[model samples]
Target chain A: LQFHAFISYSEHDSAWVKSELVPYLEKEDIQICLHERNFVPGKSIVENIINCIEKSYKSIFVLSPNFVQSEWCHYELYFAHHNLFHEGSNNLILILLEPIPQNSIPNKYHKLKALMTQRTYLQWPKEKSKRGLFWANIRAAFN
Target chain B: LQFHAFISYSEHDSAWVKSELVPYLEKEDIQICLHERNFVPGKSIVENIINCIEKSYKSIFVLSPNFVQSEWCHYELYFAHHNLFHEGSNNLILILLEPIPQNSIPNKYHKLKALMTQRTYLQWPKEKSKRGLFWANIRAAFN
Candidate 1:
């Protein structure tokens, strides 16, 4: 209700998230809520993540190398996934910052594994020429 | 008056500009008035570039391999330069899609040569990680 999207990313990816993702979406008039700045100070991080998800129209997961390693990000993904099926609204947008090899994703993240193959998610363009198409796809998600 | 920016690019770079630049700015609510579709058919092509620049808040020059080679882009760049000094507004934004070395730049483009040294402009990041910074700098130009 409060935000167009809630962004979930690993701490290691904060630079990219804070710099690139935030400004681009902000410029597009897509109100963004991020974990580092948006979370309440001390009610348990999980509580915050769940509440923020409910406040957002969509939850954006920046799936990068560091993303796979973070325990907190794992919970955030699970919470978004939990909310996805329980509410019966497909509100999660996965952004692949780096390609995660198919075999590498853990078995516990079955939903992530399945989403990778089944749906089209935004992938960060390694080559500069493809960036517009990537951002265009990001904009299309509002529909 | 009709648009936020007038895009000047070589015909060779149309795919990147249309596929990448146009969509990104369109999403950001930056009204783009481009040469391809916006220009009136019968008028002199140079006359169209002149009118479009007047209609836009800023002139965006995409400097690339093809840009330096194009005689049409040269006139566009020159017209923007002429308007800049005449109006006393720094309204030109150079976007370097490819690194054009100083010696490589034609002597006729003394303004382009000088602007490269004197001003801060958007650069197309070849590396994936620096793209956010590129877009963030782009957002900064609206101010």
Candidate 2:
């Protein structure tokens, strides 16, 4: 009955997260709550997300071009990052899921690079499939 | 506020849907709920989409070659079509956004072709900027 840490991302990354990361984490016994996979069939979608955020200890943000373009993910990231100082104690761990070319990172989010300076880089290398490496990193992050 | 119509498409044909149809639809004061945009954030992405499906008057499935390759788009289509039969009053509008070269219309979705057949089509002509004619047709479909 325990809620796992939340995984947030753009819609394009959902499938990749499911196929690549879910299986690995399941094996390691480190549970993850990703939006597209685990929610009940009929419910208030936004309220449900807010509830999960309140329950979970941490949130993982998948930063990519698609995520930046998405208003929803932007809202989620804004909530997680802003709430850390103003509203609540929900921890946010951001990962650069894609190689965002120059100037794509908005000015407001520019502080993430400095804020997360002490944190490990959760990156998927060019030659590697995102599946295994992502889970391994998740386990490492949890530790 | 009126629930926006959902636009379904694979990553390959998303640009056309966004640049061609979406902006045009926005002009009519009708917003779109394309997955990459609306369902990108929060905790439960699946529930957000399901909620949208229940709330929206119609869902426009953008069938194309790119869509067929997508496991996620296929999953979305299956859910929407299931709701069509289960939740009978809900509208299921299918738009062949791009030509599917490898596949014929799926047998399961043969019924949809009938509706689309009668509805006006906004073809993606060789001339990239010819969207004025398309917008006119969509504006006419609303009322």
Candidate 3:
């Protein structure tokens, strides 16, 4: 695959990814498809999303209150779920940046909740000390 | 109008509404339309939403991270915005339950941001002491 994973996140979290996550991942030589850099501006968001998902081996969703509220984020998530359903492969990764109460998640996001049940998700560590291990696990997941 | 306002909220915020918002408003003898009691289960969500908004004088959006992320909520917000554009009336009320960073809001929500610029919004009081005044303002706005 050209990219390790299709990085799905809300633009609101762009600063964090640009300053922290992306920089750290790139230092480790991890190649991710970011929408701002990768998606063609003239094309429809859905078209770009589908293209990105097909080109990348895995789809990574940055879960936060902001991410949850985005329609584009929902589309990316459901698209990844559809791929997993038809292909029968575990190709989705969730990175929870904040705690979202179970009851707070809308019923339409049942696919995400189901995936969480399988424990295929990672919680963003609050402790600065454990971040190294978190990055290491992320790299391992990509591999 | 059949009701003073059409209440739009994420199901995740249902408890808070039932326990606090609804009771407080009802005790003041404010007439509001809630989907749980008013919406027909057999009808499509979009249909019920349109009907509710049409029947009410105003649409009150309970804004939170969860509410923003929901597709159903987005539909309701946009539909209400569409009405405002065509009707030239201030028919939307935003109740911010929590702080959502500027960057977190999607670009597609320019209408909501524009409305916020007009300052037609109320923030939920963090202090217990201010709640009575907060509610009073809400009732005044509805009037």
Sort all candidates by lDDT, best to worst. Answer: 1, 3, 2
- Name the better of 1 and 2 by lDDT: 1
Instruction: Report the lDDT tens digits of candidate 2 across residue range B1-143.
Output: 24667666666776777786788778767767755556644323445556667766666666664454332322423353465533234365555566644224333334444444555335555565765665555555553
Question: Which segments of model 3 are wrong by more than 4 Å?
Answer: A71-73, A76-81, A85-88, B1-73, B76-143
Best-performing candidate as measured by TM-score: 3
| Tens-place lDDT digits, model 3, residues B1-143 | 79877888877688887898888878877788887678764444555767888888878788776565554334634354476433346777778887766555555556655655665568898899999887887777766
Residue pairs clashing in model 3 are: A12-B103, A69-B69
For DockQ, the strongest prediction is 3
Model 2 chain A, TM-score vs. native: 0.67
How close to the true structure is residue A69 of candidate 3, measured as C-alpha lDDT?
53
- Flag regions of model 1 displaced more than 4 Å: A1-143, B71-73, B76-81, B85-89
Q: Write the residue-wise lDDT of candidate 3 on A24-73 in tens digits.
A: 77787777886658856744445567778888887877777656555433
TM-score of predicted structure 3: 0.51
Model 2: per-residue Cα lDDT over A1-143, one tens digit each: 25557777778687767786666656776666754466754433444456666766677777676665443332433343457323223366667777554344343444443434444447666666764666566666676
Higher-ranked by lDDT: 1 or 3:
1
Which residue pairs in model 2 clash with each other? A35-B45
Q: Is candidate 1 or candidate 3 better by TM-score?
A: 3
lDDT per residue as tens, model 1, B15-51? 9898988898999898888765785875444556778
